[PDB]
């Protein structure tokens, strides 16, 4: 029994020592590798991630069907990074970025570096150069599916080529790199976090579709326990409904009381119906930050 | 004749003495090697296995087409093991575990160890370390097909490498290890049990598909006679329909009487139609356990 | 910090040195590759393009739904080129050119070279021949979608074939080539500029539809920052409402004052309502040119 | 400059040498491939065609809405051909030919070959047989839209099948073949001339509708510059108002003087109002022929 | 020239050999396929048909507006067939046959087979059965427009189904089948003769409307040159005015002399006014038959 | 010949075997399907029907202009049915039944079931329920034209819906159902008998209009040869003049002698003028029944 607990602890310890923390863990453990993170713009996803956001210096993959919200998510990551003064780059092979929508999400477009490479190889080489510079914090690649190999222009093999080198340089510079993928597997193994995202419904303000009910699953997580999920809405032209997540997480954590349709904080009603309570948190950011901080301290 | 019976018995005896019990047997013999087992969650499969479940300290392979039920089966093995206080590990290369579904099947997610290895070699080494610890009872690997060799990332040979060492350490610690495989052959020879599983139909509650008609064949069995089969349903979001198997096995064994569509036990009707009779056993677990125990004593 | 600025500058510099200027840039940078351009006939689009027009010696793609204005746009490019004495060619697979409308837009039909090829391959070969001649400045192909491969007559592969060779010869002769496409991806990668155009409304002179509200997005731009947009009207039988764009851009740039509905320049009213102010600029081209020149100097 | 003119000429020359004259041309050039033609019965259309009529040995397509005048046009082509002793065939899938109207247009019905095929394939095979005979000058098919494939009776693919073979044999025998089409694209590419025809108004002799104002556009022309247009009237029961076209073309070419409503030739009035002047030319065919010849020499 | 005549003859010959006589012909040729025919009751129509009547063993379609005379025509075909001892069938989906009117036209109602099918499919199957019996000479279907498909009761596709089989069996048994259609196209292609019939005026005996001026056009004719026309009257309660046609055809053929309003044959007046001359032929059938025979010999 | 008679007989036999007797027949044949019938109250109509009345278990349609006698006819059918002890139902959507007039015609109003449904669907469902009961012999629906679909209240489609089911249940219970229709076609195909009725004149007893001269045509008859007609009078407040029909039919059949205006039976005068002879038959019902029976035996 006890000696078995010690045997287990030693074994887990030796494994971790050889392959690194995160090479094995209990799915219910609170522990999370100590790493610099960048918020995803979604409170429930930062929590599902265990570390409070995406890890710096690591490779991350985000995949899902068309219109699932992959780009919105990455744009919110960029805005969050830029909010902290970090330098971001956008490697584009999709040719679909909407700067108007991006600014609405907080992205500083004027200072966003951008590249629209001729081939998959060129994209990967530009990524490595930015990684080795030690002067770029976040690199988003949209998308992997559009990274046509030079020969095919004039695939799976291309990715295995410079993936090992790219990972090494990203790690050394502490550069976060996100690959967006639309629904071979060199990315599957080199990524420290893989997110599965999809639209699971519509948000209706009466009878008009105004947003999407979204769900993200952390299918791979080398910094904290994997398989947790996040659910949130993406409002058209506005992005992730962060405050709506704050309303639910506040209640769940017993920081915000819910009596039927009326929500209240510290005794005073903040709104009838999830919609009004959300509007209230949004207009009172100072109190929202406190509640958010409280939730993070409780779940992270 | 008689001297021929004695000659046969001696020959079989010498063979067994040299290569172990299970190296040869009559397909119709009742005898089953005395071994600790872990239920598969399926009554007809535990019976098809001859020992009442999967053998501890041995390697087991479970293969079948996509959506055949391989994972559900392994998750039920884990839940059954955890129900007895055993420590389980999940080595994942598929990145598809659904903890919500897992808890529904009885899995204690919080205490399930999990690893998402970088390479096939790393997975195998983690397996060996957990085996040598003498502190892990069940290890599930999902899946073999996803165990990409390091070189291929930056196959058949990889498996033959540490398979002999892994088997030795598993045996010594009495650790059960299950390899899930999706449809070279080092696994084929080192495994003590190999299960072929597939979907042979759909379960309809009227006209809506609610489950899968499933069939498992024990193509290899070194603990008891091989080639027996098991048939059972896997209900969406619920797992193996254990009680439905109990209804049929109870009847077959003349413990439960069937008169047309009405089933009865000890004189009293328990339901009209296999569905209601199943519901009854499920709501009266204490009586179900007795009938289950009876069936096991009769067929094991 | 500073050393990080220098590290960034060096990295961007090395990238540019290896893959050419335009291989990476800040979306808010003023810099634009020094290149010969040809006006598109639209002031806001020439500005959105960053270089003041489409680049000579490069491949350009213009795509959009039916009736979005693709042809009108290309015809205005041709007229602008011919206004400077440049030799233009029209490779037609649509068989829909209206010379009456074309002359209205300024096109010199009599001197416009035209080809109506039998197959996609023949079209591409004619394009290459005109490119290699060093005697053709602008080549418009209408459209890509109508370039049926010979075999299919008696696709994606056809385009990848001679696209690399065509691009080389166009570059060497400094010949601008525009592919019109109606809504595989060899064009997507070889093009230096890709324009997304569509009708976003109707222009009504009371209650009669007289034009189309149009929007063009520069989804790909290898000569200056991509993703900018242009909005302008296309009047039936007249083409792009250049003067209407001049009214708005003049105001925006504080060159033309707007007080309610009355517009004025240098103190004197030029018209009440965007329509009259536009008419005034149109009848006073000499002053319009000055204002246009001013806007270009300010935004280019 | 000059060397650029020579470079252009050589390039155009090489293109023409490789793909044939007509593979590229200036829209304003006077040159027209030297080919045998058959008048369409319309003076402005024979001119719009550049060669003075439709080309022998080539495929021609004539399409337009219902009642646009497609059949009348083809019937006038047949009459013109028969006037020169040429053998004509009519492949019919519409079953609507009016011999009374046809004779009025000059068609020699008794000697017109006719076929009413069972399937699209049979029609095409009959066409090929007539082509290979070297004894048929003009073949009219009415219509393409009615050429139902055998299978569909007991489409796009059917046309691509024998279109290449038919074209070859027609060319070799110098047989003109016209496909009438009512508003896949194998015809679009194999045709040397494609005509778009439609009714753009009504002809009123007071308040009674007596004819149709018609417009034909040469959307494809491989024998001379494409995109020219023709406008003429089609009088009920009479066909194309040839003399009315002669009045306008004579004036335009300054062969016939117009002073208000009075027209005159060589000093003498021929009628007040376009209607009377037309009647005069019609009653004085010998002078009309001279004026017609003059116009052709001036515009062809 | 001559060799061209021989080339033409050979080509036409080969075509006829491959697709049958009637697959191509000169519209003015006297030749008519040698076939058994059944008079339509109209002398000018039997002549317009070229063979003297409708062809046995073939499918015929007769269409026209309501009250155009379609039924009267078919009833006269039946009477003519029955006059020769032929067995006739009437497949009815209109439910409007007037036996009193039918007997007046010569129809032997008592021996006319009749069917009033439940569905379009049933009608077609009954037709095939009667065809395959080799014991039915004429089948009239009234009408196609009323042949509602079974599914639609509890269309174009239905007709294409058994049309090929029906045609085969009709041909083999030499059974004439007529489809009446009121104003997809499987009938259009399988029919050997298609007749377009309509009312073009009224017959007045003073000021009272007593009949209809009728015109039939043979829009499709695979047994002789198509496109000929027939004009005759249909008197209320009497049917086709055969004798009135005989008066005109006799005159036209110079067998009957007309001097103003007086008609005469072989020197003797037979009546003043087309009406009396008709009455005379009708009361002197023996002489009428001779004149009729003469006309047929001259025009057939 | 003979073998052709046998071929015909076999073919007709096979047709009848496949689609039922009545699927084909000679219009002059005496044969009538053996079926239970209900007199229509009109002797000439029962004869025109071939079976002596309307068929039980089948659907019948009776249509005609307003005031043609449709209701009177159905009321006489009901009275005749009730005279034999049959249970009748009246489904009313017209709301115009006159019980006083009905009793005069022999209808037993007190025992007549009646329904005045809210919607067309409800009417049809009530009909089906009465049909499936096996306890209702005759159902009259007045009228189809008034069967407004539910949706239209808060048509052609409605009828096709339950017409097939209704027909099946009516047949199984041997229930006669009559649809009255006032002048889509699901009724047209499901009905076994369709009657066209209209007023063709007035009955004057001097100069006062006392009745209507009526004519019914059996346009559809699946139990015996169709297209026969019936003529009889409908006297105001009395119904069908049955005896007047008996006078004419008796004479026609040479059972009653007519010498000018005097009628006589078996030698003795029964009245001068059709009116008196009718009165005589009416006052001597016992002799009238014999004559009626005689006529039926002769014509049925
Ligand atoms: N320019 C925009 N303006 C307004 N709302 C936008 C815009 N772009 C995206 N959205 C919103 O973003 C939600 C998420 O879409 P998006 O993030 O672009 O999905 P995606 O999976 O990243 N893209 P793709 O691979 O092309 O389907 C949508 O359904 C829109 O409501
Ligand atoms: N998250 C889930 N929620 C509900 N039902 C599930 C879930 N996962 C699996 N099932 C059920 O499990 C049945 C068995 O599927 P599964 O056990 O995952 O097959 P598999 O062969 O193990 N997997 P794979 O190799 O990926 O096809 C399915 O058809 C589902 O009804
Ligand atoms: N011949 C013409 N005469 C007058 N106005 C024209 C003519 N051709 C085009 N236009 C105008 O051009 C606007 C732009 O149409 P167009 O430029 O032809 O779109 P497109 O996308 O290029 N063509 P397509 O692919 O065929 O739909 C129209 O809506 C018309 O108002
Ligand atoms: N039989 C005829 N008699 C008198 N005028 C005719 C006749 N046929 C055609 N026309 C005239 O021809 C003009 C041109 O019609 P037509 O040439 O038949 O057009 P279409 O496009 O060829 N036919 P379709 O495809 O059937 O609409 C008409 O509007 C008529 O004035
Ligand atoms: N029962 C009848 N009695 C007297 N004349 C009749 C009768 N039926 C038809 N006719 C005459 O037939 C001429 C031709 O009519 P008809 O032959 O029935 O045309 P239809 O096109 O066949 N029928 P439909 O489709 O119903 O319009 C009419 O105008 C009548 O003069
Ligand atoms: N209440 C009544 N009293 C006396 N005579 C009646 C009565 N109802 C009907 N009749 C007679 O019935 C003859 C036949 O009329 P009717 O049977 O009601 O025609 P209908 O076509 O059934 N009805 P509708 O659709 O309303 O016109 C009439 O002209 C009347 O002489
Ligand atoms: Mn995206
Ligand atoms: Mn699985
Ligand atoms: Mn266009
Ligand atoms: Mn036509
Ligand atoms: Mn008819
Ligand atoms: Mn009524």
Swiss-Prot record, chains A, B, C, D, E, F:
- Briefly describe its induction: Induced by DNA damage, repressed by LexA. Induced in response to low temperature. Sensitive to temperature through changes in the linking number of the DNA. Induced by cold shock (42 to 15 degrees Celsius) (at protein level). 5.1-fold induced by hydroxyurea treatment (at protein level). mRNA levels are repressed in a mazE-mazF-mediated manner.
Query: What terms describe the molecular function in GO for this protein?
Result: ATP binding; ATP hydrolysis activity; ATP-dependent activity, acting on DNA; ATP-dependent DNA damage sensor activity; damaged DNA binding; DNA-binding transcription factor binding; single-stranded DNA binding
- Judging by the UniProt lineage, the source's domain of life is Bacteria
Write out the residues that bind ATP.
64-71
User: Where would you find this protein in the cell?
Assistant: Cytoplasm
Q: Which GO terms describe its cellular component?
A: cytoplasm; DNA polymerase V complex
Q: Which UniProt keywords apply?
A: ATP-binding, Cytoplasm, DNA damage, DNA recombination, DNA repair, DNA-binding, Nucleotide-binding, SOS response, Stress response
Respond yes or no to whether keyword DNA damage is given for this record: yes
Matches recorded under CDD domains: RecA
Description of the deletion phenotype: Triple mazE-mazF-recA mutant cells no longer undergo an apoptotic-like death upon DNA damage characterized by membrane depolarization.
Which processes are annotated in GO (biological process)? cell motility; DNA damage response; DNA recombination; homologous recombination; recombinational repair; response to ionizing radiation; SOS response; translesion synthesis
Q: Do the record's keywords include ATP-binding?
A: yes
**What is the regulatory mechanism acting on its activity?**
The rate of DNA-strand exchange is stimulated by RadA.
| SMART domains per record | AAA
Q: PROSITE patterns under this entry? A: RECA_1 (PS00321), RECA_2 (PS50162), RECA_3 (PS50163)
* Role this protein plays: Required for homologous recombination and the bypass of mutagenic DNA lesions by the SOS response. Catalyzes ATP-driven homologous pairing and strand exchange of DNA molecules necessary for DNA recombinational repair. Catalyzes the hydrolysis of ATP in the presence of single-stranded DNA, the ATP-dependent uptake of single-stranded DNA by duplex DNA, and the ATP-dependent hybridization of homologous single-stranded DNAs. Mutations in this gene were selected in directed evolution experiments for resistance to intense ionizing radiation (3000 Gy).
Q: Which PANTHER family match?
A: MITOCHONDRIAL DNA REPAIR PROTEIN RECA HOMOLOG-RELATED (PTHR45900:SF1), RECA (PTHR45900)
- How does the annotation summarize its subunit structure? Polymerizes non-specifically on ssDNA to form filaments; filament formation requires ATP or ATP-gamma-S. Interacts with and activates LexA leading to autocatalytic cleavage of LexA, which derepresses the SOS regulon and activates DNA repair. Interacts with the C-terminus of RecB, facilitating loading of RecA onto ssDNA at chi sites. Interaction is decreased by ATP.
Q: Which family does it belong to?
A: Belongs to the RecA family.
Q: Under which name does UniProt file this protein?
A: Protein RecA
């Amino acid at each position: 029994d006890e000696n078995k607990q010690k045997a287990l602890a030693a074994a887990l310890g030796q494994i971790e020592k050889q392959f690194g923390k995160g090479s094995i863990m209990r799915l219910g453990e609170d522990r999370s590798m100590d790493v610099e993170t960048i918020s995803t713009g979604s409170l429930s996803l930062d929590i599902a991630l265990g570390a409070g956001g995406l890890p710096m210096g690591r490779i991350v993959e985000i995949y899902g069907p068309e219109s699932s919200g992959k780009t919105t998510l990455t744009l919110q990551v960029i805005a969050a990074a830029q909010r902290e003064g970090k330098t971001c780059a956008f490697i584009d092979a999709e040719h679909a970025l909407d700067p108007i929508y991006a600014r609405k999400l907080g992205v500083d477009i004027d200072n966003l570096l951008c590249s629209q490479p001729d081939t998959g190889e060129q994209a990967l080489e530009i990524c490595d150069a930015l990684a080795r510079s030690g002067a770029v914090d976040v690199i988003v690649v949209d998308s992997v599916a559009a990274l046509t190999p030079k020969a095919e222009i004039e695939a799976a093999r291309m990715m295995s080529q410079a993936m090992r080198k790219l990972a090494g340089n990203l790690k050394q510079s502490n550069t976060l790199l996100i690959f967006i993928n639309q629904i071979g597997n060199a990315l599957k193994f080199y990524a420290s976090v893989r997110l599965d995202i999809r639209r699971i419904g519509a948000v209706k303000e009466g009878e008009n579709v105004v947003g999407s009910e979204t769900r993200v699953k952390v299918v791979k997580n080398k910094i904290a326990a994997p398989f947790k999920q996040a659910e949130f809405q993406i409002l058209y032209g506005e992005g992730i409904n962060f405050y709506g997540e704050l309303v639910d997480l506040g209640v769940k954590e017993k920081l915000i009381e819910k009596a039927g349709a009326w929500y209240s904080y510290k005794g005073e009603k903040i709104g009838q119906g999830k919609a009004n309570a959300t509007a209230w948190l949004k207009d009172n950011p100072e109190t929202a930050k406190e509640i958010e901080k409280k939730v993070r301290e409780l779940l992270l």
